[PDB]
Amino acid sequence: NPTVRWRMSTSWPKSLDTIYGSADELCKRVGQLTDGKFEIRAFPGGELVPSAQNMDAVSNGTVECNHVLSTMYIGKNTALTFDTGLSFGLNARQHNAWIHYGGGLQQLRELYKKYNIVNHVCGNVGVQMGGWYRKEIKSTADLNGLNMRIGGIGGMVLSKLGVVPQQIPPGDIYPALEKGTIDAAEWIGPYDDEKLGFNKVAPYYYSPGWFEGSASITSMVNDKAWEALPPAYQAAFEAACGEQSMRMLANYDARNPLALRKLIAGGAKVSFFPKEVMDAVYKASQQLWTELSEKNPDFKAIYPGWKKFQEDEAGWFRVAENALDNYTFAAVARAQ
Amino acid sequence: NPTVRWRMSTSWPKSLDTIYGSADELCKRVGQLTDGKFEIRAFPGGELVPSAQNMDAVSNGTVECNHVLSTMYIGKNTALTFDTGLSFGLNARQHNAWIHYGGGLQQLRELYKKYNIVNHVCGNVGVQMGGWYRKEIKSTADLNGLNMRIGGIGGMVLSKLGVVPQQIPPGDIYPALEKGTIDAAEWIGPYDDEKLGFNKVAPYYYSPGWFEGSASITSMVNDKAWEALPPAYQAAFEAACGEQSMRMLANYDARNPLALRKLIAGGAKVSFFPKEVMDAVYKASQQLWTELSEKNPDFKAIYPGWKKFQEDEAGWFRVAENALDNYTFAAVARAQ
Numbered sequence: 001n002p003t004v005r006w007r008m009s010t011s012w013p014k015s016l017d018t019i020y021g022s023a024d025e026l027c028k029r030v031g032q033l034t035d036g037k038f039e040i041r042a043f044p045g046g047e048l049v050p051s052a053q054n055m056d057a058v059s060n061g062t063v064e065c066n067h068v069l070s071t072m073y074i075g076k077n078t079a080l081t082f083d084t085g086l087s088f089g090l091n092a093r094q095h096n097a098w099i100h101y102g103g104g105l106q107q108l109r110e111l112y113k114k115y116n117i118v119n120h121v122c123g124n125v126g127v128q129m130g131g132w133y134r135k136e137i138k139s140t141a142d143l144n145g146l147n148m149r150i151g152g153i154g155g156m157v158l159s160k161l162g163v164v165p166q167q168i169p170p171g172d173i174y175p176a177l178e179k180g181t182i183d184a185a186e187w188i189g190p191y192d193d194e195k196l197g198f199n200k201v202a203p204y205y206y207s208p209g210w211f212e213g214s215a216s217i218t219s220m221v222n223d224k225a226w227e228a229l230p231p232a233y234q235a236a237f238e239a240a241c242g243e244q245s246m247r248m249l250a251n252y253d254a255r256n257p258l259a260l261r262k263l264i265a266g267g268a269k270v271s272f273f274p275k276e277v278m279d280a281v282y283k284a285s286q287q288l289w290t291e292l293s294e295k296n297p298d299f300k301a302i303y304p305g306w307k308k309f310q311e312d313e314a315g316w317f318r319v320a321e322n323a324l325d326n327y328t329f330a331a332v333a334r335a336q
Numbered sequence: 337n338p339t340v341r342w343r344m345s346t347s348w349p350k351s352l353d354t355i356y357g358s359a360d361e362l363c364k365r366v367g368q369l370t371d372g373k374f375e376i377r378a379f380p381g382g383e384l385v386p387s388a389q390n391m392d393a394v395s396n397g398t399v400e401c402n403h404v405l406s407t408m409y410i411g412k413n414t415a416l417t418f419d420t421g422l423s424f425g426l427n428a429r430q431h432n433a434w435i436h437y438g439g440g441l442q443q444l445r446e447l448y449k450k451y452n453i454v455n456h457v458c459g460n461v462g463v464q465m466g467g468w469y470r471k472e473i474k475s476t477a478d479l480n481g482l483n484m485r486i487g488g489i490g491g492m493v494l495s496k497l498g499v500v501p502q503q504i505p506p507g508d509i510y511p512a513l514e515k516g517t518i519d520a521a522e523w524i525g526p527y528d529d530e531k532l533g534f535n536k537v538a539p540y541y542y543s544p545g546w547f548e549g550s551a552s553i554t555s556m557v558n559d560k561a562w563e564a565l566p567p568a569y570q571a572a573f574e575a576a577c578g579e580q581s582m583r584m585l586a587n588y589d590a591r592n593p594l595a596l597r598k599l600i601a602g603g604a605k606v607s608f609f610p611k612e613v614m615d616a617v618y619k620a621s622q623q624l625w626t627e628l629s630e631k632n633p634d635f636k637a638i639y640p641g642w643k644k645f646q647e648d649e650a651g652w653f654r655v656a657e658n659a660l661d662n663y664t665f666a667a668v669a670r671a672q
């Protein structure tokens with residue numbers, strides 16, 4: 001097999017040894033699998049192109065691949081939200097099940113042909129936190145008029161409640177929050193959020209980030225770059241992505257607990273969103289799916305099967321996984 | 337003309353097709369990664385050696401690797417329980433986090449090296465069910481004298497409450513339930529149980545299966561066979577295992593819900609173990625760990641750190657992950 005050299009434009013700061021670290025691991029593994037012959041170099045967000053351009057830069061061949069949240073690019077097609085995740089959507093396990101064994105990947109591949117891309121799921125961050133605020137969120141009144149940084153489809157939901165959302169890139173969130181040009185910000189969770197500093201300027205940390213059931217990460221590959229690879233190199237990339245689909249989330253799961261404990265020790269006020277706020281955003285989410293199905297044939301094509309899959313998945317996880325986890329987590333706490 | 341040729345002795349009949357199929361996928365991916373030059377052939381349980389001998393067969397070099405449930409070999413060393421999962425143990429995500437980012441893999445590698453093995457995690461079954469019961473379980477009194485097909489660690493815990501674990505060939509479980517020779521049987525979960533029709537002869541299908549936690553699947557590799565591989569072939573095996581750690585579970589997550597629907601349509605009564613029963617089996621499990629730790633320094637050395645990891649994980653998952661999943665699963669049910 002030949003020597004192949006690619007650039008991977010990520011959307012993340014190097015400081016995030018979780019999500020960026022996973023991109024680096026992916027590249028390293030592809031190298032190992034090919035004796036260094038398939039060399040992919042990852043670049044932090046903003047280095048090669050602004051992260052807002054990471055999809056376009058893959059479609060036009062500027063870079064061979066990226067490492068992104070696909071719904072940053074929601075302005076291209078709202079059906080991209082099936083790739084990243086829907087609000088109150090599938091959890092990480094259920095999402096990977098839908099993708100690989102429920103027909104999701106093939107439906108997304110068809111979508112991505114419109115953009116000269118071959119997509120691969122390559123990570124997940126799980127259920128996100130609800131973000132950082134300067135005041136208590138007691139009711140939906142506290143969301144009306146809020147200038148909030150939020151990535152993904154959740155912005156579209158929150159706009160219905162009067163939030164003014166923006167997908168400001170990660171490295172730019174803290175300076176805006178610090179300056180006060182945004183009032184609130186969500187990123188991912190305790191480990192990453194501590195790295196970026198939001199707790200220094202915002203006292204309240206809410207949970208859960210309903211914004212996605214899980215935030216799944218995608219590597220978009222230029223379709224001509226993909227085609228040019230020999231079969232073993234395609235397999236290397238696929239397997240490395242499948243592996244990071246476990247490993248990235250495993251790193252978050254390992255690292256987040258201590259980070260939260262430290263955030264609380266340092267003064268963060270951690271609270272659940274009130275039930276009434278949860279109900280309001282849930283209802284707004286359901287209204288959004290009705291709208292997107294009516295307006296976007298690509299969303300309409302995927303939604304019904306996706307919805308049936310969620311219904312089946314949720315029913316089963318409620319019976320077994322969650323029956324056990326809810327019991328065990330409480331028993332472990334009592335025993336502590 | 338392969339460069340390396342290995343045999344993989346699995347513990348499964350091909351009819352356990354989610355698990356055996358994953359072993360096949362693993363071997364196929366390794367072939368893809370190496371243009372067929374690292375050839376691994378999988379074999380069903382018993383074809384090369386009995387499944388009970390799969391660990392020793394690898395230790396002795398009879399075969400290069402296996403595909404097994406490590407708790408089958410707890411008679412050799414009870415610390416192997418940490419590889420597969422403890423009763424009321426980690427969930428699948430938490431186990432993979434412990435293994436890859438929490439120090440678990442290194443602790444298990446040190447244990448396995450003494451048996452001439454390099455171990456890799458390569459799958460997870462997810463939470464299984466509590467089994468098929470002819471009669472309702474209302475309290476721990478109903479466990480005393482219960483003749484239940486169950487083994488391993490679950491049997492050891494339940495025996496403390498007066499259950500009499502039963503050993504019976506797989507094809508004899510259905511007729512044994514039909515005749516009332518046994519009162520109850522655990523097999524696996526909906527996908528596999530559906531093929532055997534236990535619902536037709538023992539309608540109460542109890543949840544959750546706490547017995548095995550979220551059982552992880554291991555490939556034990558002979559250490560000299562492992563060391564003899566070219567590094568790209570080591571990486572191929574590692575990556576294929578990391579990938580199957582996601583894919584096997586994804587396939588069970590996709591498959592189990594349809595099977596559960598079929599079981600319910602055949603008369604399965606999904607039932608939940610009462611709180612009093614759950615508390616009693618949790619307590620009995622903790623007594624077992626105390627005893628295993630007192631008897632085996634290898635178990636004692638791992639347990640406290642594993643327990644702390646579980647406490648840390650449970651504390652964090654309660655904040656966001658389970659907060660959202662519990663909300664969503666309930667909402668999805670209402671909308672359906």
Ligand SMILES: O=C(O)c1ccccn1
Pocket residue numbers: 069125128150151152186187188215
């Ligand atoms: O832009 C975001 O909000 C983001 C990106 C990656 C993962 C989760 N969230």
Ligand SMILES: [Ca+2]
Pocket residue numbers: 128150151152186187188215
């Ligand atoms: Ca986010």
